[PDB]
Amino acid sequence: EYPVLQKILIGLILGAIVGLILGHYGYAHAVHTYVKPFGDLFVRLLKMLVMPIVFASLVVGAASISPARLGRVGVKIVVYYLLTSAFAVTLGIIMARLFNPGAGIHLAVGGQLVHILLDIVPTNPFGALANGQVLPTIFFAIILGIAITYLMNSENEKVRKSAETLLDAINGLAEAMYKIVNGVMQYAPIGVFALIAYVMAEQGVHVVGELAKVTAAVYVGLTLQILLVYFVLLKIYGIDPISFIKHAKDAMLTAFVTRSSSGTLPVTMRVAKEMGISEGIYSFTLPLGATINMDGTALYQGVCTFFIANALGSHLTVGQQLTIVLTAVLASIGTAGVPGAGAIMLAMVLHSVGLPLTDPNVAAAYAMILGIDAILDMGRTMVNVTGDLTGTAIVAKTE
Amino acid sequence: EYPVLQKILIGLILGAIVGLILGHYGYAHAVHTYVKPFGDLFVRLLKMLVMPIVFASLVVGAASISPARLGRVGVKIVVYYLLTSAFAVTLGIIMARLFNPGAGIHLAVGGQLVHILLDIVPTNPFGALANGQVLPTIFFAIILGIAITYLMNSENEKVRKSAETLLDAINGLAEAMYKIVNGVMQYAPIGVFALIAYVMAEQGVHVVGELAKVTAAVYVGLTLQILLVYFVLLKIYGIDPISFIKHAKDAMLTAFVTRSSSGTLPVTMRVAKEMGISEGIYSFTLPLGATINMDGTALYQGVCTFFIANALGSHLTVGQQLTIVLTAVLASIGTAGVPGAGAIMLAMVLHSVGLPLTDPNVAAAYAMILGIDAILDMGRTMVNVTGDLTGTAIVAKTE
Amino acid sequence: EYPVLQKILIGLILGAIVGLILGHYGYAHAVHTYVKPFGDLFVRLLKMLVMPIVFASLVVGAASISPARLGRVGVKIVVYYLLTSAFAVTLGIIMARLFNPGAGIHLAVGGQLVHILLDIVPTNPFGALANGQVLPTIFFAIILGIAITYLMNSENEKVRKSAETLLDAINGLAEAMYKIVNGVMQYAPIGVFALIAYVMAEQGVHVVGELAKVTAAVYVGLTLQILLVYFVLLKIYGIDPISFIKHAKDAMLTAFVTRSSSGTLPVTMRVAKEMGISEGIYSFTLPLGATINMDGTALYQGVCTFFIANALGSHLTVGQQLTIVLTAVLASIGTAGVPGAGAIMLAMVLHSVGLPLTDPNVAAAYAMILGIDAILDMGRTMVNVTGDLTGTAIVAKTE
Amino acid sequence: GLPLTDPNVAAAYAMILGIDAILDMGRTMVNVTGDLTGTAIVAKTE
Amino acid sequence: FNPGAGIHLAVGGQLVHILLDIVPTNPFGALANGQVLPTIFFAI
Ligand code: NA
Ligand code: NA
Ligand code: NA
């Protein structure tokens, strides 16, 4: 069309500024109703593609890889995702001591599954698809793909002819989705402009005071996470870090602007295609990654728990701090669903951190974080989306 | 089977008489529980086919036409649909002055979007399909069809092979639906018999009095609409009017008997196929037409607003009358959904006509219209369905 | 893997014993939360496959059989299913006089559709699939299959090419489900172990007393049903009874263990494939059979009505007894849906048997049956699943 | 025997609804006289 | 007066407890919520 990747940067910088201006003069609503819609439409289109592209891609990927292999890749990636997720909150806490974000806050307070695994097996695969539901889709999509392999090896040609057909056909759909992700991308500059403008209009005005301290703490945390873990692990597995960022650029910017791992999945999955990773590998991991792995979100969980505990002048035993890591890692898997999951998890860490949300001051401090949540979420997600790409590139390198 | 198109006329004439008899003797319920079901079953079958036939046909159509072309055809048709819709209410009003339907009615009364466009983009195409949802389907079906074109041009043969497959396969389904629409048609005589019998049993008994005047006004309005606009525009674009009616006959009769533009879409879409219009053209316009364009319904909206305003001896400023047109045109697009949309729109024109529905006399008059709604709706729909066919034949002629 | 069919028997015998032990010591809950889940996962997997495997298989079957033929086979099987169902309750009653199960129970009590056919026609085929809904699926699947035949006879090759494709592709999916049903089967021994263990834990402890008498009466009833009707009708149609049981063995054991006709439908449909019955025949009848025909459940309905009527010392006129048969046969078709349908039907026979459930003693006796319901349901289902297989083998023999 | 659900039956009913107070005023003044009268008569019998 | 003349429109188509209630169960409750009849009863 015109510039194109700049087009996005022009829109992002220009937007986040125009929004910050508009917001300061109390036009946040004016934006919301006039500007924000154009952003939605971007997210809309992306969502749309997810379900076919996840489904179709995985059948094909799973068909054209060995079974034990997924086994490998699965175990690898699951083990990966957890180490990065666990490590990432520890870097959050480390970032949280560096900036003391709960200083003042001159206020205080005293006071006091199997089913989930079962659910991965959809009872209606059609039903599965139809209502969002990424995980049961992943499950069935692999089962289907594997099946197909066995059908094309079958002695009967009349059989392999149907199996080939169905495969091709599914790939048709799969491929055609990658096609559309480029379409949907061309509207990305316009889309991106509206998304960040709206978020700066909403919670720009908020980054003032001790709340800037928490934001800075997160964002340095994320920047540090990328260089200390992702760049280190990329070098350590013989893949060039700076080339990676060239490739992931759209995935990463879309992730940052939408704040939806799910929503950004077709961009992320096109990036892995263009990096020339096999469908067998990314098709299984990236969608598993959208739901299982939430590194960047788990980082900010770490720093926010501190903001609140510092706020009330809570001890926060060093022994306690590691339980912050454990639960918030357990929480990210548990909140696969990204509807302000970040704030939910937070409410959760406090349910077990011992600080009841019902107590006003605990609420008060939570309230503040709520006012800054998108600003955090944008970052947290771009780190989340890099996390999977990285893992997937590493796990692909081992094959 | 037996006669066949007569079979329908025998059933229609025979039915609408038998129903009118049964009704006069208060057997309207007897009919309802014994006869009407047979009519349902006809509507049923038709419904069923819509979703696949709309979706499948459009992917193929959109695949096998130029992109800018849809652009053209879309603009053409959208512009068309509005002129015909706007014009049609003016002919309603013109018909409404001709017959004064609110004479007596010797009673009086005094007293005093973005989101929508967003919604066209489905977030789950599967979900879209599953729950009725024709528009988001139309969107995604075009997106898919276009994508496919680009896939069959791709340098990689392994690609074009999948794309071809998926295309073919979709057309298989598409074609197969046209197949079934002839099946479903063979039961049309029986189906038609029950539908009109039921409607004459229910609101035959009602066409007495000033209510006949509104009915006559509508029906002449519709007859006039066909000759003054559809026949005039057919000649004016070099297509033979009398031949058109030969072709549209089933589409038209089904439309009249069912009262669902949606429901009648497979018949209408088969009629366009048999007229030899390209799938690229009718596949996009006819389903758009089912929801956007409601000429015949908008005509009766015009005449009914008058019945009510005359009823209360309201001024109805000539300046006011044009706002009747504007809102009722804006309303037909808004109530794409045909569950007694006609009566809903009417309630809406009054919400803005200034006559509150809460006032008993305003309600009283409204009530009367309610009692005659099907009798109007049958007509109004047969005009609606001709409207799209015509538009689609004209737009096709331009290509 | 390892043994395999024994693997199932080892797990069944070992489980039903281990469960009975664990239950007697009040660990029923311990089982429920620790063991039962492994059983679920088995049912889960089987369910999943049903919808595609029913749908895909039938399109193909219906495509590749004559229309009038389904006509035949449908009529045959419908007439079959009813005779077997009617007969089976008469054998229940005959079994109920043999064992007097309402003896003591030294307690007494005195005191005092079209729509359904319409529903078979889905309005959204996609919607049909998506939400369970087997029947409207069957309907549309046949309509689709037949359609396709007509498309491959069509003069235009470009047509037959799509029709072939779509067919192939659907068969791909169909075949692939059969593939997965073997997968799902390999986990059957583990699956079966949890299912029966949980049911013995829950209602083992209950088979004590007059309740054993009803259980025995049912179970002899089912054993008798197989030999007196299924074996007799197999010989009488020239098919070897003992070979049948060899083939049906997985179908029958899965049916017994899950208690879901629906759930066991992919095993049952694989058994008919491996018996070499045509897809045209079993594809239409076995799914119809999962919902229409419930012989074994209707047998225990017959014996339970007696338990309760004996309990209160009700007359139970011999004329009354036949109305027990009629309604309980009408009830099985009516409760196609297997969520404890058996107890629902029972509540229904009493709604019309004259004994109101509201009366405590009527309830009391009902309560007892509720406590034994699974133990009965297991049996009743394994007879239900045999019922269709048999019918299907017989109707297949006539072709 | 005239069901209110039938629109025209409703329509006519609607009209009456619009005049209901005008009727109710009168209807009540006659209602209140009714008891007073009855009460005066029954009092006269004692 | 023929009041349904026109109206040029047409249409075809197709206790013990109460006595018990007079006896309030709470006279105070009776008073408190409107309730004229049970009041009359108790008052007598
Ligand atoms: Na992620
Ligand atoms: Na229309
Ligand atoms: Na069955």
Numbering used by the authors:
A (entry chain A), B (entry chain B), C (entry chain C): 9 to 120, 130 to 416
D (entry chain D): 371 to 416
E (entry chain D): 107 to 120, 130 to 159
What did the original publication write about this model?
Therefore, we crystallized GltPh-R397A in the presence of 400 mM Na+, but in the absence of L-asp. The structure of the Na+-only bound GltPh-R397A shows HP2 in a conformation overall similar to that observed in the fully bound transporter, but with an opened tip. This opening is smaller than the opening observed previously in the structure of GltPh in complex with the blocker L-threo-β-benzyloxyaspartate, and it is hinged at two well-conserved glycine residues at positions 351 and 357. Indeed, the structure of Tl+-bound GltPhin is indistinguishable from the fully bound GltPhin and both Na1 and Na2 sites are occupied by Tl+ ions. The structure of Na+-bound GltPh-R397A differs significantly from the fully bound GltPh-R397A only at the tip of HP2 (also see below). The coordinating residues at the Na1 site are correctly positioned and the site is likely occupied by a Na+ ion. The Na2 site still shows a distorted geometry: the last helical turn of HP2a points away from the site due to the altered conformation of the tip of HP2. Therefore, opening of the HP2 tip upon Na+ binding in the outward-facing state may serve as a structural mechanism preventing uncoupled uptake of Na+ ions. We suggest that the structural changes in the NMD motif and HP2 that are triggered upon Na+ binding at the Na1 site may lead to the loss of direct interactions between the tip of HP2 and the rest of the transport domain, resulting in tip opening. Subsequent binding of L-asp and Na+ at the Na2 site is then required to provide compensatory interactions, allowing HP2 tip to close. Ion binding to the Na1 site of the outward-facing apo transport domain triggers isomerization into bound-like conformation, formation of the L-asp and Na2 binding sites and HP2 opening, impeding translocation of the domain.
Glutamate transporters, or excitatory amino acid transporters (EAATs), reside in the plasma membranes of glial cells and neurons, where they catalyze the re-uptake of the neurotransmitters glutamate and aspartate (L-asp). Key mechanistic and structural insights into this family of transporters come from studies on an archaeal homologue from Pyrococcus horikoshii, GltPh, which symports L-asp together with three Na+ ions; however, it shows no dependence on counter-transport of K+ under the conditions tested. GltPh, like EAATs, is a homo-trimer. Each protomer consists of a central scaffolding trimerization domain and a peripheral transport domain containing the substrate and ion binding sites.
